Structure formats: structure tokens, C-alpha cells
Assembly symmetry: D3
Homo-oligomer: 237 residues x 6
């Protein structure tokens, strides 16, 4: 057991999907995992382990923010033998052509945070995902007939940022989506030798100002989850 996870080695699979919302983890466990057992509830950060098409898989919330997901992923990698982490969340759109229900894969992640600079002698550390995991995700989305956009995400420390001019910048440099963990998770993965990937569905559009709500929205969220789950299956083969 670690400070934020009350479980023991073996309780988690070597791969863990991680949404920001713990309630979302329970939703993933019951919707896609068979024989899912809760392996953690500390601070209400629900974690589950089960199987997908016979493969052992875990899913657990990481809370909101780089500081939050950093603790959890680190504890998973160094104390529970987790070798892969796939964040599955929502991001805000900045690019006009990126429509809602578009699955976004963060090959890289820009950031507002100072954590990677702390780690990298105040230089620029390019926070990137594991290449194979990105490829597995793209191929899985393909097999499912889903159009995935691979590019840069932006991990912000302030969901309510005082600088709105930054969004024009993110747009100029092609940032595909804005969220709050990717850069943090990739920094932890590189620091402790594991692999990570972040997948997002666009729920908000800071461009055309139009969030999402319909059966269609929830269908895209599940597609993302399937992409994540199927991508690990391809990784095993």
C-alpha cells in the first residue's frame, strides 16, 4: 500500500486506463470489464481491476491536475508494477477544424506547469507519449472506423486561466486539445521508466463555444474507451 492507494502488489494490471473522474472509472469497470473488483477507495479515488476479452486490465481515476495525476501514476509505476498508463479523458478544443466527437491522441503535450522544468534543469523537456502506444491506439481506432487526430495537447494548471490570449497561441501552433494532466503523466513516465498515453474526446469548443450533450456524445466517449482497451490488446501481440 502507498500513501494514496490502499492496495497490494497484484491488485492492479500492468496497464491502467485513467479518467480524471473516479465515478468515470466505475463507469468503465462496469461497462467494459468482466469480473471487476474495486481495489482502491482512498480519498474516493475508485480503482478497479477486471478483464477485457480475457486480458487483465485496471482502471482508476487520477483526479484533476498534474499534481494529482502525478502522485497516482508514480505510485502505480513504482509500487504496483504498472508498466503502462492510458489517460482517457476530455479536452477543450482550440482548433476550428477539430470537431466534437473527434478522438484526440496526444503524441506530445505542452504545458503551463513548472514540473518538467524542475525535472529538466529548467530547460525544455518535450513531454511525449510512448510511440508504440500511440501507434496501437491509431490502429485500434482504425479497426473501429474512427478518425483519430494525433498531435499536441496542452496541459494547463488553471482551468480558469487569467490569460485568454494564450488560446490564440495554442491555436497558432496547432494544439489539438486543452486538458490538465498529459504533460504531468508523461513527465512521470519518463522519470520512472514506464510508458504513458493520453486519449481525449472533444467535449468543449473554446472556438465555436459549443460543448456536447446527446447519445452521440456518450457514443464517442465509449469509442475512446474501446480504442484504449483494444490498443492494449494490439500491444500484447
Amino acid at each position: 500500500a502507498t500513501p494514496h492507494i490502499n492496495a497490494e502488489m497484484g491488485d492492479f494490471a500492468d496497464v491502467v486506463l485513467m479518467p480524471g473522474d473516479p465515478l468515470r472509472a466505475k463507469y468503465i469497470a462496469e461497462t467494459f470489464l468482466e469480473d471487476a473488483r474495486e481495489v482502491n477507495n482512498v480519498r474516493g479515488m475508485l480503482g478497479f481491476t477486471g478483464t477485457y476479452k480475457g486480458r487483465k486490465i485496471s482502471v482508476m481515476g487520477h483526479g484533476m491536475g498534474i499534481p494529482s495525476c502525478s502522485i497516482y501514476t508514480k505510485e502505480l509505476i513504482t509500487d504496483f508494477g504498472v508498466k503502462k498508463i492510458i489517460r482517457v479523458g476530455s479536452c477543450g478544443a482550440v482548433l476550428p477544424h477539430v470537431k466534437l466527437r473527434d478522438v484526440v491522441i496526444g503524441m506530445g503535450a505542452c504545458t503551463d506547469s513548472k514540473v518538467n522544468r524542475i525535472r529538466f534543469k529548467d530547460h525544455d523537456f518535450a513531454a511525449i507519449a510512448d510511440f508504440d502506444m500511440v501507434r496501437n491506439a491509431v490502429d485500434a481506432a482504425k479497426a473501429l472506423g474512427i478518425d483519430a487526430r494525433v498531435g499536441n495537447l496542452f496541459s494547463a494548471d488553471l482551468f480558469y486561466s487569467p490569460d485568454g490570449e494564450m488560446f490564440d497561441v495554442m491555436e497558432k501552433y496547432g494544439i489539438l486539445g486543452v486538458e490538465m494532466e498529459a504533460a504531468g503523466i508523461y513527465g512521470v513516465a519518463a522519470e520512472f521508466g514506464a510508458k504513458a498515453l493520453t486519449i481525449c474526446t472533444v467535449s468543449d469548443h473554446i472556438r465555436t463555444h459549443e460543448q456536447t450533450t446527446a447519445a452521440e456524445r456518450q457514443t464517442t466517449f465509449n469509442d475512446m474507451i474501446k480504442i484504449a482497451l483494444e490498443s492494449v490488446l494490439l500491444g500484447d501481440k
Copy 2:
């Protein structure tokens, strides 16, 4: 209802106690509040509103890290008329003379986060608590015969910091406790026009390594909650 809180203007008191852990907010509602009523459960961030010796009070977790509490404190302040936020949590100590279970009042909060620099044109913004709130807490503590140090806290972005030596710097400058929120909450308070104070219980020494133990946790934690609740009363008078 805001993006992370499903409640309506009026569901919250004008003062809100906030621990990091949502499960603690619940325990506080059940232990110190009468007519406890759950006003939010989005993302499992349990929020309660009740009464303490006649005063309307609210208690809701804020999650871990500056990005997490910044979201909640902001939404409470701008959409629920919350005037005062009182963070009640745990912190690690760096000063040898600061022993476990000690109660620390964060008059100020240092940080390695970039949030305030982003707000303050990259200059040094002194993240400070509201003076009256600090004084109220100091007084409530004396009335309860409890010792309470007043000074600087350090809000870290990385619980698992790769910069060990920074703790020597914290010690040299008198940091009373190491946590992960104060500086963010104080930043938001100044930005959105509210008042805040962070009270922390010394859960361990970053040096010695002695995580919370036995039933000591409850007494001290209850003392902190007692100090914060009473301080709110002295504040009204």
C-alpha cells in the same frame, strides 16, 4: 450549477471548510454539523452544508494539488457566494522543532507552482491569507488550549519531488509545513475577491518518515476542525 459542482446558489454557506480528501468532508459533516445535507457529489467531491452552534457552514473536499483546489475554490466564490474558504489539511514538516500533530496556520504560502507568476506578470506575488481569519484561528486555538504556529507553508506541485535539496532551502527559510494547495487558494482568493486561510496538521516529517499513526490522527484532526469552526464564530462577532 458550475462545471464541477452540481448545486445552486444558496446550497452553500458563505464560509466553507475544505479538506483535500472528500471522505474527510463527509466525516466532518457527520461529526461537527447538525442537519448535514449533501450538496454535491460530482467527481465524488462530496460537499456538505449544515449548522455548527447555529451557524450555517459548508464542508467540501478540494482534491489534491493547486490545479484541483483552484477549480473548486473558484466556482464556490463566483457562483455560490462563498466569502471565506478555510483549508483544513495535513502537511509534512521540515523544521526539526516542529513536531508531529502540530497545528500550523499558513499566514503565507510559498510555492514552486507557476500559477501566481502567470497571474502576476512573472513577478513575485506573496500568497497570503486574510489577516482577520488568521487572527480568529489563533484566538480560537488559545480558547481551546491548543498550540498553533503561524508562518509560511510551502505548496508543492510534486509530492514526489525530484529535488530533495529544496527541503533544506525550505528549512533554512522557516517553512512550517509542506502541502499542495495554500498558494493556489490564496492566489484564487486575491483574483476573485474573497478571503482564505489554510490550517494544517503536521502528519509527518519529510526527513524522519513517520506517516500518521494510531488514534492520534482523529484527536488532532478534530482539534483543527474545532479551531477552524470556532474561528468562523469569532469572525462573525
Copy 3:
């Protein structure tokens, strides 16, 4: 004798009031101290030690700017056993509701100086005053029927700042007064193990431009000195 103070251990009281202007230190010695004795004149930075209602007190100018007062406060603390430093000066206001002659207590001090970043590994060090000293001053002020705001000051390196807009940022974050020392004095206090507090008289509005006028200066200045001197008494009791 230190490099900038020709005095000997014992020439100074354990508490020292310090205005920026050396000529003010003299006026204070003559006006409020009995048995006033000049203990330093190096670089014309007049220093005095006398008695106030029986208490041994010292008053010496610290010059203008963080680099200047850092030198003096440091030498007093490390070579003359000075335990408490109380800066008593003037400040420009940025908040419309803060009017001229207002008395401000710097609980905290923001700055655009790099001194604290150099001390704090380039992180954010919250330059704060000693809590008891702030409280003593707030009380001394009430006993004198004087209004005194408590909050953040901004210590600027450039009196003639080429960044006008920064004042809007100061206003937005509630800076009560703009001066040029607080943050440095608080930094030195933490570094060398002493206590400090900065009290300022609002000499004008950075906006309106209304430099000190008539005999109002003397009354208010004397009120500030009265508040600082009395605060030292409440401190001993």
C-alpha cells in the same frame, strides 16, 4: 563595527525603527526618544539609540531600495543583536479606496526584485512579516484610534518603472501600497533569523499624482511612529 555601520555590539537596542530617509531617523530620535544618542553616521546613514517610555529603542535610516536596506538590516541582525526591525516609511497607492495618509501594515510583500528567487532556488518565496509584530501594530493602532489596513505591499526595484500596466496588476490583486523595501527586509529576516514588519503611510496615488502636502505629513508620520513604538511595547508585555 561592520562595513557600513561604525558602532559596537550594545550600541543598538534589540528593536530598530527604520525609515528610508536618514534625516527622518534623526527627527524621530529628537521627537520620540529620550537621551537620544547618535550611534552611526557612516555614509550619512544616521543611527540613534534612546528610550521611549523606558524602553531602549533604536532608529536608523536604511536608504532606498532592497539592496540598500538588505545591507543595513543584515549588519544589524548579525553584528548588533538586533531582534526586530520595523520599517516605517511612505508608499504609493494603487487602490482607489485606499486614500492618502492611510496607514498600511505589510503582512506580506510582493516584489519584482530577484533577491528572494536567488535565495529560494528560483521558486516563489512568500515574503511575510512576523505575525505577532503585525498584530501588535494593529492593536497599538486601535488603542490610538487610528485606521490601519493589513495586507500586501509591493516592493519595486524601479521607482520610475517602464511598465505602467503592472500597476493594474497590483490593483487587481489588492496591493495596498507600493514601496521599495519590504520584500527585501522580510527576505533578510528569514535568512538571518530575525523578525520584521513594515508600516507605511500612503504618501500619494500612483494614479492621481498628489505628492505629500502641508502639515498633514507630520501628523500622519507621527501616528505611524506612535503605532510602531507602541507596538514594540505590546510586544514586550
Copy 4:
């Protein structure tokens, strides 16, 4: 015609291969392209356009350092309609498990340069390559029986860096190779909406300097060019 490219729109292909040394550009043109025609001589930075298996392609040296290649890549993107830039060169390794002559694909590029911060409001921009180009290169390498590693490169501003401890950091964070352009080219591509990729062959090892014959170097360099060239064909399919 631009400040450093004396040619007209159409003279270059929509895809440009760029070696560090200009001499290599002429070699590439006469060794792998057919019907090559010179298109630029300014500053001795030779430029060539021709075909590889029917595909129109251009090659030209980009010089050493982020500033040099930023000039050329920018002009090609905005004035000659270039859509893809592939830098082909050498790099030094810091990882023991990375051998000389190993082919490294830079999915991302870290850097100690300020060009990206100046572009990104002083935040962390993750300088990444175009994902499809990365996979094309990996698949082309596989088809040619060549082993290819994908990950981070480090673009140094100083070949003779005053800091030797930084190499330990690079190793700790998995940097595959050290060179001097990638982060700059990726920044430029992002700024002007184009795609870029950097492929390097491990020339030396900052570790234990091994040894390679001019013959072995020849083979490796041609493998890198074929990879690059075949990757372009895969991209078209």
C-alpha cells in the same frame, strides 16, 4: 527568391530532405535522385530537386544550430510551398543501450534554446514531429531490415556545453540522441502549419567513444537516406 534562397516558387518539391553539411546535399542528389537540377547556391548551401521512384523531392543543407535551420525551414515553408521537411543527420548518444550507427527517429525534441518559449508565452511547447512521418520512417526502416529507435532528441544550443551534469539528466529522461536542430525545426513547422521529422544516426557516444570506419559510416548514412526517401513514398500511400 528569399534572403537565403535564390530560387522561385516551384523550384523545390513539397518535400525537402535536409542534411547538416551542404556537401552531403550534393551527394544525396547524385546518389539517390534522378534528373536532379540545382536550385540554390547562396552561401554555399547547395539545393537540389529531382525524383526518387517518380516522386519529386528536394534536398539542401540546413547548417548547424537552431537559428540556421530555422531560417531555411521557414523560408521553404512560406515561400516555396514546402509541406514536409526531413532533417537527416548525426547525433551523440547518452544511453548505454544506444549503440553507434543506430538509427534514431525524433518523435519529440527537448532543448535548452529559448526560441520556443519566446514563441509560446514562456511556457513549455512540446516540440514534436508529425506522427505519420514518424511511423512512415519506422515502417520504411523495418522494410529495409533496419532497427529504428523512436523517442526524444535533445537540441543543444551549445555543442561545448558548460554543464556536463545535464547529460546525466538527459540519460535519466531517456533522451536517445543529442543534436542541434530538431526542436527548432519542429517549432517552425508548428508555427507555419507544416510537417517535420528528424532522423539521426548515432555518430559518437558521449560515454566511451567507440570507433567506426569511414566505410561503416558510409553504409549507415545511406541507410538513413533510404529510410527518409522510402518514408516519403509510404506517406504518399
Copy 5:
């Protein structure tokens, strides 16, 4: 009259020598100027105007630190028609070969301060003296048979710096002397269109740890002053 100088246009010469110590200004006025009249005493910062070999010359203290000298030089340049400022002070040695009684001329000045970054969009502004003034100084020293070293000075914000490793750095890059104003004065000169120069005599040796005291020491200080005075005479011709 300006906020820190109680004088009127004409009271100062268009050239002003400035030592840090106001008492030193009086020493210069009486030792080298004929018919010297005090033109300022605000805050005890003595200023004088007289003639040297028939030329109108002024001398005035600037206090200690960039923040201090910035105010004074700015007020002199923009309100008293001063076109030239020559700081004449003392500096600490860092280079072994730079002996005591060596006259140092700061063609440039490095710094710890953030003031020039505030002015220069956070970039590197090379704080330099006016070339002609440097040349006049070198020629004047020559005519007097004095060996002047021209190079870089280092303007520190902290006379008592917490980082001693910086001195090795200053030494590695050939900094000839350490003081506290040059960089500030050069920033003001460039900002308001005037010319400045800083001349120093080495009084302390942070290398061999040996200050200076003798008739010889005071002879070198006067040589520096003569150099400054004679250099302006050459400037007029």
C-alpha cells in the same frame, strides 16, 4: 525640483560624478572643485556644483544599490539636463591578477538584478558605458601614468549573497570587479538617452581576502577621481 532632489535647472553641471557615499561627494567637492556650492541635501544625499580647471562640474552621491542610483540618475537626466554621469566608486576583486589600487573601468556590467530584463522584454540587455567616455577615461589615466583595466563589472543586488559559487563564475568569465550600481546606471542611461560610465578602485579582494588601508589606498582613490575629472575635459575638446 524632483522627488529626491531639491534643486532647480542649472544647479547641476551637464556632467555629474557620482560616488555611492554622500560624504564622499562632499570630499570630492572640497578636494577637487573650486567655488563649490551644495545644491541638494534631500535624504542627506549631498550634491555639489563647482568648477575643475574652469569647467563646471557636479558631484553627488547615489546611495547603495541599483534601485537607489536609478532614481537619482534618472532625475538628473530628465529634469536637470545632465548629459553624462560618471560613477566613481569602489568594487570587490574577483580576478587574482587584478591587484589593489588598480583603476577599473566598466565598459560593460553584468548583473543579478531583474531591472534590465523588465526593460528588455525579459531578454539579455548588454548594459554598457558610452564608448567615448570609456576612451576619454583610458586616455586620461594614461596621461597620468595610471594603468587602467577596461572590462566587465558585476552589479549585485546582494552585498551579502547567499551563493558564493557565483564568484567562481564571475572569475571564469573575467569580471574585473563587483559593485552594486553600474548595470543600473547603464540601463537608465540607455532608457533616457544619456551617457554613463563607471570607474572603480579595488578596495577588497574576495580572492586573496585583503582589503586596503594606507596613504597609498587614498592616493589611488584620488587618482580615479582625477581620471574622471580629466576625462570630461578631454570629452569637451
Copy 6:
């Protein structure tokens, strides 16, 4: 022989002239030096040694950007005993009173590069030329009836800077010319104990782009070389 210079100690003179474009190096050698012998061909960066009025002198292109010239200047200083480096090239002007073909001597060089901060503990290093070399160049220019301006140059990392407002800043602070190497060469020279100078001729004007005939350009370029060459002779005297 070094990584970028295939020559041996003695092949170069203790003084090296460096133009941006390598083609210019061959021109300088056959137009102003006698008995010239090639000493380097690596990467097409031609090197030559010979004599000018009996004085041994070398010339070789340094490429574009701080990173490029830093490599070459460092190797020449540490491996070929070079004592003086004179960069001769062009620059863009931002000051209206600075006309095309004007000769500019860089006593100092500002920059937006991080190389000097990385070298100087993140402080402001004033990248300055060797004073004697500056005066030699000014005197040589005078002797040749050429007008020469002395002051700051700005070494940009990005020829195509995203910020256009910075040019206003440069103008406000008197920058005489914009180029891309000076600050880097001065940094290197300071690091390895050598002397450097940068001389530029105003090629274009970021203001109103005027016009110059290839003939006028020829004349101006030769004037700059003579200046440089004659300045070396003056330095020897």
C-alpha cells in the same frame, strides 16, 4: 584536428577574421592576404592563413547563428591557440539615424538566446567585445576616412521573430544593428579567456527598405575588411 576543423596547431594565426558566408572567406584570402594557404574544408567552411603587411592572419566563415559560431570560435580558441576573433558581416538597423552601408562596431551585444544565462547562473552577462580591439577598429576606420558607430548589437536567435514589438524596444534602447552571432562569440571568448570583436555593415533597414547596388555593397564590404585588418595592425602597435 577538431570535430569541425581538420587542421593542426599552427595552421591558424593568433588572429582570425570570420565572415558569415564561407564563400566570403575565400574572397578575403585572395583579395587582402598574401601567400595564402588553405587550412580547412570541413562542411564547406573554408579556412585560410596568410599575411597582410607581414602580419600573419587567418580567415574562415563562422556560419549563421550563435550555435554555429560558438562551435568554431571555441575550437579555434582552445585547440589552435587563437587569441583574437573578429567577426565581419552585415546587420539590419532599427534606428532611423543609422543609414545603409554604415559601419557598426559592437562594443556589446544584446540577445534573446539562453547560452549566456546557462553559462552565468541565469543572471545577466554583459556580452562585450575586447575594448582595445574596439578602439583599434575605430581608429582604423578614422584613418580610412570611414565613419564608424560604436554601441550595442542585438544577436537574434530567430531571423523571423514572432515578436515585431521587440524592434521598437531595440530602437528605444539604442541598438545599432541586428545580427545573429556577436553575443555568442563574446560569451565564448569570455569563457575561454580570449578577445573578440564584431564589425557589421548595415545591409538592410527593418524600417523603410532602401536600395544598394552590388557595386556599393562591394565597396562597403572591402572597407569593413580593411578596417578589421588595419585594426589588427594597430593592436600590435
